[PDB]
Structure 1
Amino acid sequence: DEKICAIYPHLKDSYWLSVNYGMVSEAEKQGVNLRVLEAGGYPNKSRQEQQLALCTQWGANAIILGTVDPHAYEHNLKSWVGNTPVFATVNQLDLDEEQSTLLKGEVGVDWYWMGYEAGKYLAERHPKGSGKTNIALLLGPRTRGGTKPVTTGFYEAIKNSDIHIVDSFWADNDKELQRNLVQRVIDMGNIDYIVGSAVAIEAAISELRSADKTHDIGLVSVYLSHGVYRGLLRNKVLFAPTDKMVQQGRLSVMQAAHYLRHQPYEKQASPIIKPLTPKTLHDDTIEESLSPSEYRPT
């Protein structure tokens, strides 16, 4: 019986459909009172500010916020929640010296090590000299840890080796916009591998089959999803770094549940990224990653 209000940016990804299982399951395991309000979309800032204000009205002691933007409540958070202590759940929450006075704990995995984990897999599969390998980058839009954060990460792990980037295509993470990006890729010709979002890769899986190049282009994800997973389970996908979502959720619940019972909790927590391959699918780790089946967001 404790007021904990989780504010997601949406609940469409399997990414958050999982981060959900994490706060949910870690809420009945700590017997707290957690309610979930999803902004319905990233460009739905106005709706989150209100749901954020709705949380307070509901009387939320501490609220776990998954912002639809880092610089959204940078100079205003308190102005929507007051003395309420906020806990960043999955995204960077940049506050001011004044606003910051609210943040008591924050979970979040530096994506740099997700791109790194991905490039490391290919630099180890194509060591310098092994033979020039042309690759295609289909990461995502041009902001939310889908570029420079992951890029530089990927870039580093790939620099001193025989892996060349033919090019890179940006586009929102809509399956259709990415599919289009994949198709263009298949048409180029020199592409050996495609490293992109779980969205991109999922599309590539169907596109490579529909175009009989299933075994001609290797798929490497920059994160995991119920789709990219099934692909690993069927060699349709090669690699994929899992930043354990289900657990990333539990972490946030615990953080606030502890700060509200004065127990010790890690201020700046972040699970450890685990490398996954077609056979390297350790059950214990996929459990703290992707939600169960037959399940349903609650």
Structure 2
Amino acid sequence: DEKICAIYPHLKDSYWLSVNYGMVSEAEKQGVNLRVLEAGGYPNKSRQEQQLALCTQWGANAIILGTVDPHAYEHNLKSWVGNTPVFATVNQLDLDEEQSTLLKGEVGVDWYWMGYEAGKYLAERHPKGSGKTNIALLLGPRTKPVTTGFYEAIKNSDIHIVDSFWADNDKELQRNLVQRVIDMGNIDYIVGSAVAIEAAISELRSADKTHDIGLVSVYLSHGVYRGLLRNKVLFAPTDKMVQQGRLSVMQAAHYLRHQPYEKQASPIIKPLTPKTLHDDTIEESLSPSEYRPTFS
């Protein structure tokens, strides 16, 4: 049983809980020995380094890495993992050619299309000449693929962005902005991060503005899914987290077992609306209703 070590940026998200189910599930079908570690969160640059080194000391045959930053390990990696085969997951892991020696596989989705899809839904619901419609952006921390992609789909379409607030992807911080958006009341939709949209669902109910403001999520999560399913959310795209999870394991498994495999895997984004929640599509996105984070 080959030893595969997976290192995430964290594991508090609905997103990574799902990426986890993907790996733990695939790892078991592929018959490998998965062991997963999660940095404290995106700011724990050093903790991830120790973990990268820790995977090596465990004697991992391959490392599945979800960088806590793109340019970290860009000139190291071999300094932490030595020369263990590494496969990128979810996040962009760029590293010079001297380092790339280790890159055997990549899995992930260009977050430009995630934002583009979200915008496209709005662009079509409100075409040019149908009626100026006011939007509010709540995309997160701080450019940024999602944003530029949204902007391109919104290009030419009667949809006007009244304002765009930013803040860390913390439930409470996001709730704060949703509350702010609600008070300036000349908004028809709130396009935002899963977490923000989730807040908005509750905040729109306690303020009786359900029916007033529509919600469009820039990505999926249980909660946002639960919102679509119950008609509290209008639209949200999926980059099939569970699948991104399976692929990384499959890549590593095959590379070691000397088998064929997409060197650069990338699931096909899919749009979701309350009336189009195809099982197969969400089964490839969110973790099952009973799954608890598993690390081996």
TM-score (norm 1): 0.98
**2:278 — aligned with what?**
282
Q: Deviations over 1:219-245 (max 9, x none)?
A: 000000001000001110000001110
- Picking from 232, 238, 253, the partner of 1:236 is 232
1:234-280 Cα offsets, whole Å, 9 max, x none, are 11000000111001100000011111011111011100000000010
SS at match of 1:247: helix
Match status 1:219 vs 2:220: no
**Aligned equivalents of 1:260, 1:139: Cα separation in 2:** 39
* Cα deviation 1:38-64 (Å, max 9, x = unaligned): 112111111110011000000001100
Instruction: Write out the 4+ residue segments of structure 1 that deviate beyond 4 Å after TM superposition.
Output: none
CA displacement 1:119-166 (0-9 Å, x = unmatched): 0100110000110000000000028xxxx2011111111111000000
Tell me how far 1:93 sits from its aligned partner. Answer: 0.4
- Using the alignment, how far apart are the partners of 2:95 and 2:252 within structure 1? 18
Q: 1:35-89: per-residue Cα shift (whole Å, max 9, x none)?
A: 0011121111111100110000000011000011001100001000011011001
- Residue 189 (structure 1) shift: 1.3
C-alpha root-mean-square deviation of aligned residues, in Å?
Answer: 0.8
Aligned to 2:198, the other structure's residue is in SS state helix
Q: Quick one: distance in 2 between partners of 1:49 and 1:140?
A: 26
TM-superposed CA distance for 1:17, in Å, is 0.3
Matched position secondary structure for 1:5: strand
SS of corresponding position for 2:79? helix
Q: Whole-Å Cα distance in 1 between the matches of residues 142 and 95 of structure 2?
A: 22
How many correspondences in the alignment? 294
Distance in 2, matches of 1:292 and 1:269, equals 23
**Counterparts of 2:122 and 2:46, CA distance in 1:** 42
Deviation of 1:295 (Å): 1.4
Give secondary structure in 2 for the equivalent of 1:124. Answer: helix
2-structure distance, mates of 1:195, 1:271: 23
CA distance in 2, matches of 1:295, 1:112: 30
Give the 3-state SS of the residue equivalent to 2:261 in structure 1. coil
User: d(CA) in 1 for partners of 2:206 and 2:9?
Assistant: 34
SS of 1:7 mapped into structure 2: strand
Residue 218 of structure 1 deviates from its aligned partner by: 0.3
Distance in 1 separating the partners of 2:104 and 2:69: 19
State the alpha-carbon separation in 2 of the partners of residues 48 and 114 from structure 1. 27
Q: After TM superposition, give the deviation of residue 100 of structure 1 in Å.
A: 1.1
Superimposed CA distance per residue, residues 193-229 of structure 1 (whole angstroms, 9 cap, x where no aligned partner): 0000000000000000000001100000000000100
User: Whole-Å Cα distance in 2 between the matches of residues 249 and 192 of structure 1?
Assistant: 36
Q: Distance in 2 between matches of 1:175 and 1:198?
A: 10
Whole-Å separation in 2 of the counterparts to 1:160 and 1:294? 44
- Cα distance between partner residues in 2 of 1:91 and 1:15: 12
SS of the aligned residue for 1:254 comes to helix
The CA distance in 1 between the partners of 2:137 and 2:274, in whole Å, is: 21
- Give the TM-score normalised by the residue count of structure 2: 0.98
Separation in 1 of the partners of 2:153 and 2:69? 28
Deviation at 1:192, TM superposition (A): 0.3
2:142 & 2:6 partners in 1: Cα distance? 26
